[PDB]
Amino acid sequence: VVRKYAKKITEWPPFEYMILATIIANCIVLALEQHLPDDDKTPMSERLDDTEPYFIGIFCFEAGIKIIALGFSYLRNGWNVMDFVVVLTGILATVGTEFDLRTLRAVRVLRPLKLVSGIPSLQVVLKSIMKAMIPLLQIGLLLFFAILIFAIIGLEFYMGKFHTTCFEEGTDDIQGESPAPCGTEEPARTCPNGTKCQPYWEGPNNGITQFDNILFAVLTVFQCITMEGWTDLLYNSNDASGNTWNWLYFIPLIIIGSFFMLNLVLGVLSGEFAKERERVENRRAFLKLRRQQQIERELNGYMEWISKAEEVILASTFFHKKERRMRFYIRRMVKTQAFYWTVLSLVALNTLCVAIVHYNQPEWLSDFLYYAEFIFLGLFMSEMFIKMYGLGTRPYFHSSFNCFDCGVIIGSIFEVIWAVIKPGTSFGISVLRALRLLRIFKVTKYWASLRNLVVSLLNSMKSIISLLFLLFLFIVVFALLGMQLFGGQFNFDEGTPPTNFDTFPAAIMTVFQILTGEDWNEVMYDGIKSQGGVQGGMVFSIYFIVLTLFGNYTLLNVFLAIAVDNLANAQELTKDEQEEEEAANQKLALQKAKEVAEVSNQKPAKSVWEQRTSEMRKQNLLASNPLRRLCHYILNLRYFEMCILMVIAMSSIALAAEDPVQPNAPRNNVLRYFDYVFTGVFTFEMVIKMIDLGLVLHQGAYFRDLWNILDFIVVSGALVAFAFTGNSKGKDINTIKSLRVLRVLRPLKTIKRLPKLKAVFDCVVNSLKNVFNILIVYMLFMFIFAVVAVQLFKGKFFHCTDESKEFEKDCRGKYLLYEKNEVKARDREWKKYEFHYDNVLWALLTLFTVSTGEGWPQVLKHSVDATFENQGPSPGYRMEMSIFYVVYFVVFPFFFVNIFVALIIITFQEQGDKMMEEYSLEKNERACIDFAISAKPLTRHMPQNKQSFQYRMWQFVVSPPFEYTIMAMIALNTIVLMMKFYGASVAYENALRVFNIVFTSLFSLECVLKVMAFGILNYFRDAWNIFDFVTVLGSITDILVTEFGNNFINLSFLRLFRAARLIKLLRQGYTIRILLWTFVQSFKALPYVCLLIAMLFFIYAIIGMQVFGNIGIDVEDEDSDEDEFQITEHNNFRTFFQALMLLFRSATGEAWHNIMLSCLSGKPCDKNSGILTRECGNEFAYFYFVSFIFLCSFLMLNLFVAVIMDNFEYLTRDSSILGPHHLDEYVRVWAEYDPAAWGRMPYLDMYQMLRHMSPPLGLGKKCPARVAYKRLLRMDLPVADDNTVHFNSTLMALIRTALDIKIAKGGADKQQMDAELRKEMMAIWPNLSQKTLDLLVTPHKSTDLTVGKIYAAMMIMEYYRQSKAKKLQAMREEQDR
């Protein structure tokens, strides 16, 4: 209440500081609360609960004083609204215990957010995040539509199929404790002999995952979209109904909804960041940074000058001057090259010494490393002392690197002292000295870019801390919410899961794990199970859905913005410094040449990012031996090259048909002769190429180009393999096996032979070359982390089969395994964990597995349970080790991966596009004038002959009621498809069938009506309309098949035609349709980039088939050890399609490390292999899987960046500046004015033409007439003898006027700029007919009556009329006196 203006006093700033302190204290109090099951309470919680009155009183006082002093504008600000609603909720919850409302205790989680309300900088940072996040809403709409379509399809196909397991024969009891879907026929999974398939098993994941309602379907589809547990669903559906067709539903689901959506998100975010960079404030900040850097460079030069000049000022301790002379000498010695190189050598030696440490290093090695660490510490301390005494204490402290070395020395001393005081743990702090190896980049040319990146990072260091703090605040808020909702309710009968919400650290860990997206579905299952189950706890899935959906995209936005901004700033600084040093060199040389006058290349092609950024900057600033020749002839012969390509393709296809399981299969025997023929052909090709190229240092010979060496390796391996089996094959079979494996290089023999495929491979190679230095930095940081992890967790990853025994000596004999309803005797084994930290290599592998995201929660549990060396784990021993894995996730996967993505996006090179030096104005005019060339008016039927009946019904068809009725029926049919649910009555199903019949009859009637209105040819000349006709036919066919009965079921793919009506709704989402069409066109434009990935998958599938193809799958252990036995009947290598499925599953990143472990050596072989010993599987699996993951990720990233950069014009468009996107509205309206659409429209209506559409192309309905006529003058559009203007001629004038293409201000200059434009268009479009050129750029005759002349005359007449009218008024007002 305002209360007028009586004695109201402002508040002093430490009042606000006290409010912040109160908020922090309340956050601490909320974080110090523990939740216990049922009604138990800790004593500390009871004390903590009584502090709420004080906090609510302070908040009430703040709200009251602010509202009384401000005289509510309190509710105008959103932050004040949040504070006010928090205050009211708290005071209502506290006062009045009616109904025991705890839902109003959940509002307290939002109190941490009041810190942002207090601090305006956090408000600014949230504004920055949210503004960039707004464009993603259109992507979310696409995601929702795709999820809805796939949920409808799954509900239609997978309805209630997962409620049938292998029940016991005699009784209705589950056969085992791991139920799986079953069927009652061969295609499905048949139950064992003593079991039967009986209905209503609960279902996978306790029934949470299923397709029963439209809600379960949507949740299931979303979970599959997050790439979590989708292979489990694929395997369950394969068990339930066979594996023939389920892949067509699951793999395209992943491809469309997880990779395509990610590509769209990356493109939109990149466009938003590019548009944000060129804003005025960011430009001013960058200019300030660049000027400061120039100042620092000049200062450094002058400081070197003064240092050298002052050093030459020279010309016991007090008596002798040696105390200063020797300091001068050592200061001179410091800057010598040797004093730097030897220090780097010692740093490298220390790095090697700390890397050597492993689990069972010999005792002499331990002593040597102890003494070596002491000696290295002493030597580095001596280097510190010499540096400080030579250069001076203050100059030493001023340098940042000297401070870093001081920190490392102090850390080493602290580690030594702590190890002496408290033996048991070591942090290996000395390994951080390896960061000094980054100084080696100074001798290379890569130092400038890295230094600029570091400078840009250090400049915007507050804006990074603020972003991290806001991320932490959101994590804290969600952790508090999870504690309020679930809390102590996770005490299941089988034990509390490690990912619980009981305590605050556990809540933070769980929320972080959900944000990273790893095993979030299991936590969701536990959360749903806590409040009942599938019956009455399914509403709590919203928490996890919101958490993961927001976390993925917020992490992506927050880190990609940082990476892109800093890398772009670094690139621009580097380019500017290079150009300014070049300019200074030429200017200095020119000025110096005046004194000696008496005696007397190409810049690198700019990236698409840089070109578009420069264009946007300019646009914004505008606002203000006979056989040797015979063989040479043969290799140039067309039939030969086509035959070689055909033979290579046949070889690749043949490699995919072999049988890994059975060497003596009838198909392998046949394929052997194909191998003979292919080897002979390749021998002939190689020998003829040898004849032409030669061998004796011709410098253009065979062995100079790598592809020739590859071909030689392939053919020589084939011949050697044929040679060894020459006699006695049983001597060595691995030898012939490896040489057979060498055949997989045949697919690669097309990269050189297909010019475009080589043009894609070279682009991939350039992408590798651009990111090499960041890769080196990434490897160095990962090496440091691996060494630290080795120090922390060396030998601590030993466990026992019996958990009660801690040491090795106790883990011998037999122990009782108390399982549900059965007690089993097992053996005690002192096993090591699957992924440990024993040496640097194992640590690197484990950290790579963690970075890929798979199985890192298990590694975290093992790390926090590690007690001591050679000792069993104890749960919750050292919970502080979670900081290691938090920092690792913050550094590598969140920051370095996004740096890689940003660098590849920024430094992308446009494919082809010739050299474009001759062309001048094509930055944005290309597509505009090209669309002007290829512009076609929209055509309606318009016969005009049959006005009596045909015209009326044509009007009826294309009319707002018709379109709205179609949309309404589409929406209702969508709802009808959604209302299917499991367990409905027969009447419900019959009603749904009748509704479907009615809707399809309505659609058929509209098809008939449009056919009548337009004519069959015009009906069938519009792709959407053929789609409608096909869908109608499919629905009719489905209905006829249903009503027929019996016969063949004709599957259910006809019902996909029923469900495909949703695509018709895309005709209203203009922005969405344009986005989808642009990205699909870009994907179609690049066919070989999508072929390189296919080739990679092919090669790796063949390698897997030939290496791991014979691993046995029949064996199932007593416990089955699901973790390690991941090679089953669903995830095997036995055939090409199964190998491809396994490769795709690994590419999606789902327990690939377990597959890698399962493919190692020592595994049992298959019965039909022919090997009777456990000698199947190789240690090659490590390299196989790691290289596959890296290469697949790189190739998908390259494809995504290629598509984004191809669409980068649309992604960075601006509404104010004309683009080809707005041109279609013009086209539509122009076609509309003329029903015939002959291409000529009267010049009078052209004024109404411009006013209806919005600027920049149009003028707007509010445009003044004088402003309207002024633009018309610049168009100079000629008028035809029939007083009409041509469609194409108007468009070119419209485009030209808005973009100022060559636009001269008048005079003879106009003819020259028309002449130059004509030559450029002919140079770009040689096939453009002269008639079209004269139509687009009209030859200017003086006699021609243009539109500008017509409008100029009326203004002159109007000005003359107005001037005359004023003159009569003037001659009258002056006469009345």
Ligand SMILES: CCCCCCCCCCCCCCCCCC(=O)OC[C@H](COP(=O)(O)OCCN)OC(=O)CCCCCCCCCCCCCCCCC
């Ligand atoms: C934003 C853009 C959105 C775009 C959305 C695009 C969505 C496309 C998604 C793919 C659609 C097809 C999904 C197929 C799922 C099949 C599920 C299934 O269970 O099929 C097997 C089943 C036979 O099993 P049975 O138990 O006898 O009958 C079950 C009926 N309740 O039923 C059958 O007998 C099979 C039924 C036919 C299934 C496939 C029909 C072909 C569809 C695509 C053809 C492509 C060309 C052919 C390629 C493969 C050749 C083998």
Ligand SMILES: CCCCCCCCCC(=O)OC[C@H](COP(=O)([O-])OC[C@H](N)C(=O)O)OC(=O)CCCCCCCCC
């Ligand atoms: C050397 C440079 C490597 C760069 C790699 C791409 C980096 C940019 C991609 C990106 O950041 O998007 C992250 C997004 C999050 O999905 P996610 O968090 O749901 O991943 C789930 C997890 N993998 C699991 O199944 O356990 O989705 C992803 O996880 C990315 C999907 C895998 C990588 C791209 C496809 C490659 C396989 C076909």
Ligand SMILES: CC(C)CCC[C@@H](C)[C@H]1CC[C@H]2[C@@H]3CC=C4C[C@@H](OC(=O)CCC(=O)O)CC[C@]4(C)[C@H]3CC[C@]12C
């Ligand atoms: C900057 C880079 C180039 C430095 C060189 C690489 C090192 C970090 C790696 C390369 C190979 C590694 C070695 C590979 C295998 C072993 C054997 C390992 O010994 C045992 O397994 C048992 C020893 C015993 O019982 O006597 C001790 C560590 C060591 C030397 C590793 C120490 C770390 C090494 C030297």
Ligand SMILES: CC(C)CCC[C@@H](C)[C@H]1CC[C@H]2[C@@H]3CC=C4C[C@@H](OC(=O)CCC(=O)O)CC[C@]4(C)[C@H]3CC[C@]12C
């Ligand atoms: C995607 C491009 C690279 C072409 C696709 C290549 C493979 C996916 C295709 C091509 C020929 C196909 C083969 C052609 C014939 C057969 C025989 C067919 O008969 C059998 O069951 C084995 C024969 C027997 O039982 O004696 C089994 C599938 C198989 C191996 C096919 C498996 C899939 C192959 C290798």
Ligand SMILES: CC(C)CCC[C@@H](C)[C@H]1CC[C@H]2[C@@H]3CC=C4C[C@@H](OC(=O)CCC(=O)O)CC[C@]4(C)[C@H]3CC[C@]12C
């Ligand atoms: C985006 C980034 C900046 C946010 C990451 C959040 C971190 C600040 C959180 C997440 C996990 C937290 C850790 C989880 C577990 C612990 C152990 C715990 O310390 C104990 O000794 C508690 C004993 C026990 O819980 O049994 C509390 C501190 C610590 C290191 C926590 C400190 C704060 C951490 C690192």
Ligand SMILES: CC(C)CCC[C@@H](C)[C@H]1CC[C@H]2[C@@H]3CC=C4C[C@@H](O)CC[C@]4(C)[C@H]3CC[C@]12C
């Ligand atoms: C050399 C390394 C990078 C190989 C590439 C491995 C790929 C498969 C890994 C490494 C980087 C990873 C992603 C980087 C970014 C994100 C987004 C964040 O919301 C969760 C972590 C997550 C999901 C990571 C999971 C999968 C991922 C793409």
Ligand SMILES: CC(C)CCC[C@@H](C)[C@H]1CC[C@H]2[C@@H]3CC=C4C[C@@H](O)CC[C@]4(C)[C@H]3CC[C@]12C
């Ligand atoms: C090598 C070229 C032709 C590529 C095409 C390979 C495919 C289409 C051909 C080549 C050799 C063929 C095999 C030759 C012999 C047999 C043994 C017979 O009992 C079953 C079919 C089977 C297993 C054939 C299946 C189809 C097959 C694998």
Ligand SMILES: CC(C)CCC[C@@H](C)[C@H]1CC[C@H]2[C@@H]3CC=C4C[C@@H](O)CC[C@]4(C)[C@H]3CC[C@]12C
């Ligand atoms: C950015 C570069 C320099 C990486 C170096 C920083 C890494 C290696 C440091 C930063 C913070 C560190 C952690 C801080 C605190 C603890 C608790 C202690 O009881 C065990 C080690 C542990 C868990 C440290 C492990 C190493 C660690 C993660």
Ligand SMILES: CC(C)CCC[C@@H](C)[C@H]1CC[C@H]2[C@@H]3CC=C4C[C@@H](O)CC[C@]4(C)[C@H]3CC[C@]12C
């Ligand atoms: C566009 C909007 C208004 C319509 C979408 C909502 C419809 C399609 C959804 C939302 C709520 C859903 C219902 C929710 C609960 C049940 C009870 C269950 O035993 C059978 C399915 C049934 C009956 C669902 C059928 C589909 C349903 C009616």
Ligand SMILES: CC(C)CCC[C@@H](C)[C@H]1CC[C@H]2[C@@H]3CC=C4C[C@@H](O)CC[C@]4(C)[C@H]3CC[C@]12C
């Ligand atoms: C490009 C690739 C081939 C180069 C990398 C080579 C290294 C990482 C890999 C590739 C081939 C691998 C070998 C292939 C086969 C075997 C037989 C197995 O019973 C023991 C390990 C051993 C001896 C592997 C050791 C690791 C290995 C040497």
Ligand SMILES: *[C@@H]1O[C@H](CO)[C@@H](O)[C@H](O)[C@H]1NC(C)=O
């Ligand atoms: C399993 O099926 C085979 C079919 O011949 C039969 O020999 C065997 O006895 C069956 N086992 C049981 C439990 O009947």
Ligand SMILES: [Ca+2]
């Ligand atoms: Ca996963």
